[PDB]
């Protein structure tokens, strides 16, 4: 139930449950359950504590929730402080990869602020 310092859903499969350790999607999920040999279809409700800590060891081979969160924030802080175009683009809460800003670009800009 407890993998990488966090909890995984007991009523779901293994592939799906591991999609909650922020830093592993589906591919890495199949990769864990290959390197550990648990069938992708089994619900972790049906594991033993040893299978569960083997799941912990195989996930332990990556940068995860705390690691990933703060290392990502470190990269975006490098960008923030570099003053490069990505620096201004994150300082501005604007898009950062050249999408159009005449129109929607709303995922960044948020809701509309009418004049």
């Amino acid at each position: 139930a407890r993998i990488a310092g966090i909890n995984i859903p007991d009523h779901k499969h293994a592939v799906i449950a591991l999609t909650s350790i922020y830093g592993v999607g589906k591919t890495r999920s199949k990769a864990i359950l290959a390197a550990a040999g648990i069938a992708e279809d089994v619900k972790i409700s049906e594991l033993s504590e040893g299978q569960i800590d083997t799941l912990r060891d195989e996930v332990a081979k990556f940068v995860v929730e705390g690691d990933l969160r703060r290392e990502i924030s470190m990269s975006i802080k490098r960008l923030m402080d570099l003053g490069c175009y990505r620096g201004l683009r994150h300082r501005r809460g604007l898009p950062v990869r050249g999408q159009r800003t005449k129109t929607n670009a709303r995922t960044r800009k948020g809701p509309r602020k009418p004049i």
């Binding site: 570099l82 490069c84 175009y85 004049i115």
Partner: protein, 84 residues
């Protein structure tokens, strides 16, 4: 980005100017136009002026910018916000 198989791009004039400026210390700014030059480990300490369309920016090169292009440090558009 540029694929690794080719190596990091650099403009001849930029590289030779930083080169004969390297061997002569931190001289005057090296006003450059090639905003497409990638930055090289030996320019740490250089002050080089880059073009934004009309001006040259006094961009001091640090260790931390290595690997990126030169033109990312000179904004080409001036936007001080709408309805100011």
């Amino acid at each position: 980005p540029r694929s690794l198989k080719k190596g990091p791009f650099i403009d001849l004039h930029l590289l030779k100017k930083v080169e004969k400026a390297v061997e002569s210390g931190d001289k005057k700014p090296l006003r450059t136009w090639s905003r497409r030059s990638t930055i090289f480990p030996n320019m740490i300490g250089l002050t080089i002026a880059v073009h934004n369309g009309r001006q040259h920016v006094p961009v001091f090169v640090t260790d931390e910018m290595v690997g990126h292009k030169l033109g990312e440090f000179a904004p080409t558009r001036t936007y001080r916000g709408h309805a100011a």
